[PDB]
Amino acid sequence: VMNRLILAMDLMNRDDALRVTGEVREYIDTVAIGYPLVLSEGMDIIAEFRKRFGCRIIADFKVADIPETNEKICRATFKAGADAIIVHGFPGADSVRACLNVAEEMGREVFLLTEMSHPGAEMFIQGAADEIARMGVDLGVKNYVGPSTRPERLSRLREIIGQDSFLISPGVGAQGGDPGETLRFADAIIVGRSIYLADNPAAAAAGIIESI
Amino acid sequence: VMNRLILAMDLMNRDDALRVTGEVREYIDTVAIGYPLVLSEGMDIIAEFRKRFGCRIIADFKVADIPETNEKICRATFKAGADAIIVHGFPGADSVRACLNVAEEMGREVFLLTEMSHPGAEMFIQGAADEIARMGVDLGVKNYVGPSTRPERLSRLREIIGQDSFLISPGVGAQGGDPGETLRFADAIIVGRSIYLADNPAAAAAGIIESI
Numbered sequence: 001v002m003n004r005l006i007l008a009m010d011l012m013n014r015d016d017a018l019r020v021t022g023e024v025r026e027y028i029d030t031v032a033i034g035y036p037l038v039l040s041e042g043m044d045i046i047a048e049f050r051k052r053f054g055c056r057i058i059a060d061f062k063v064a065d066i067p068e069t070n071e072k073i074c075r076a077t078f079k080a081g082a083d084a085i086i087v088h089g090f091p092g093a094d095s096v097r098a099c100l101n102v103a104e105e106m107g108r109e110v111f112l113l114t115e116m117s118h119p120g121a122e123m124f125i126q127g128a129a130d131e132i133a134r135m136g137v138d139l140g141v142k143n144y145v146g147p148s149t150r151p152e153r154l155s156r157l158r159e160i161i162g163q164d165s166f167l168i169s170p171g172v173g174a175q176g177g178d179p180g181e182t183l184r185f186a187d188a189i190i191v192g193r194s195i196y197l198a199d200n201p202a203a204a205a206a207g208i209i210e211s212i
Numbered sequence: 213v214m215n216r217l218i219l220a221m222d223l224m225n226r227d228d229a230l231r232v233t234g235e236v237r238e239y240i241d242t243v244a245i246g247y248p249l250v251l252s253e254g255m256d257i258i259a260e261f262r263k264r265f266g267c268r269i270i271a272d273f274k275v276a277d278i279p280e281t282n283e284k285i286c287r288a289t290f291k292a293g294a295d296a297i298i299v300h301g302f303p304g305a306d307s308v309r310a311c312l313n314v315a316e317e318m319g320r321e322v323f324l325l326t327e328m329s330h331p332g333a334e335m336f337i338q339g340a341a342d343e344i345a346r347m348g349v350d351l352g353v354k355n356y357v358g359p360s361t362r363p364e365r366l367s368r369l370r371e372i373i374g375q376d377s378f379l380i381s382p383g384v385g386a387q388g389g390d391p392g393e394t395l396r397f398a399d400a401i402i403v404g405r406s407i408y409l410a411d412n413p414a415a416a417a418a419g420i421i422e423s424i
């Protein structure tokens with residue numbers, strides 16, 4: 001992705017989300033849109049962003065349901081125009097396969113979330129993360145999400161998925177992760193608050209890019 | 213699109229197509245892939261390009277069949293990963309609507325080809341072009357294709373579709389169209405041979421961009 005930087009657009013109103021995204025578009029061509037914005041403004045916001053900014057959109061929906069429901073969520077999300085969707089791996093292989101099947105049918109991509117960046121991830125997710133990553137490899141997953149806040153875990157994840165897989169990483173800035181260190185292992189970093197809550201989002205994005 | 217320039221990749225072998233596209237990727241982020249490449253290397257080439265170059269892909273398939281077949285062609289094309297498809301308008305409204313319905317279902321876009329750039333277009337297409345464009349407006353089409361070789365016709369087309377519609381235009385360079393003049397009316401120009409047959413495709417792309 002451009003400058004190896006993905007904007008996590010978690011503002012909850014359309015006007016502010018459009019303003020900040022437009023201000024940083026010269027530095028970023030990929031935006032992660034999640035439920036905070038979608039549940040506040042509707043799924044139509046995805047197509048609006050894609051058209052207005054000409055950016056790729058990753059739906060950060062952390063899909064985590066049974067196979068049948070996962071298929072419906074993925075279909076609705078790709079119908080809305082998303083280029084990719086983030087899916088949790090802890091619910092198991094059948095749930096991930098359901099997402100992969102819809103992405104195959106619709107010409108889109110699935111990103112498998114393996115270990116999360118927040119403190120609570122140490123309770124249950126971290127202990128299953130290596131196996132979740134190996135499961136992804138076994139299913140043919142080529143895109144993964146791992147934690148900026150734990151570079152030793154990001155390194156282990158990169159080890160399991162190989163150099164050919166694409167790995168993106170949130171937890172940079174506000175959560176404590178460092179851009180440069182994270183990019184030693186991840187292909188791109190996801191940054192939300194450090195950019196969208198900044199007094200000058202464009203200056204914040206430019207500063208992150210210059211630091212790397 | 214980046215630099216308002218779209219590469220028409222009509223080489224017929226994968227190695228040469230990948231080489232030229234990689235050489236000009238710093239100048240272009242949108243590639244039109246048509247049947248010369250797809251019928252020679254397979255539909256899988258679309259996903260390969262999208263991944264390898266991170267570019268948007270327009271399938272320049274000039275869809276021109278009955279509604280039922282158009283739906284199948286569009287479904288197969290979007291399944292392959294194309295972001296948009298070019299559809300002929302001369303076969304009529306039902307044929308275009310079939311394409312629009314599949315694009316809506318799959319979160320993608322349809323570009324309506326209204327008047328073609330080659331000499332033969334004067335025989336039958338030119339006389340129906342204004343009505344084909346008006347039909348597109350009536351159907352809700354927002355993306356159009358018009359001829360670089362006839363700027364007065366491109367102007368008339370822009371007049372019918374309005375300033376809000378997106379208009380791209382082939383026939384630049386080899387066919388005689390001028391980049392600058394075309395961009396007075398079109399949002400982006402499509403260029404094939406002037407770039408892909410050049411001794412230095414990157415220098416050719418850079419030269420077009422500097423001229424505008």
Ligand SMILES: O=c1cnn([C@@H]2O[C@H](COP(=O)(O)O)[C@@H](O)[C@H]2O)c(=O)[nH]1
Binds near residue numbers: 115117118171191194
């Ligand atoms: O393990 C994960 C997975 N996803 N995200 C998401 O990535 C973004 C990070 O935002 P931030 O830069 O403001 O902390 C938010 O959308 C958040 O839901 C994390 O932070 N950690």
Ligand SMILES: O=c1cnn([C@@H]2O[C@H](COP(=O)(O)O)[C@@H](O)[C@H]2O)c(=O)[nH]1
Binds near residue numbers: 325383403
């Ligand atoms: O009216 C039209 C519609 N489509 N194209 C297409 O646009 C490209 C133009 O290539 P060129 O720059 O090599 O002439 C080719 O893929 C061609 O099929 C035209 O040239 N004219």
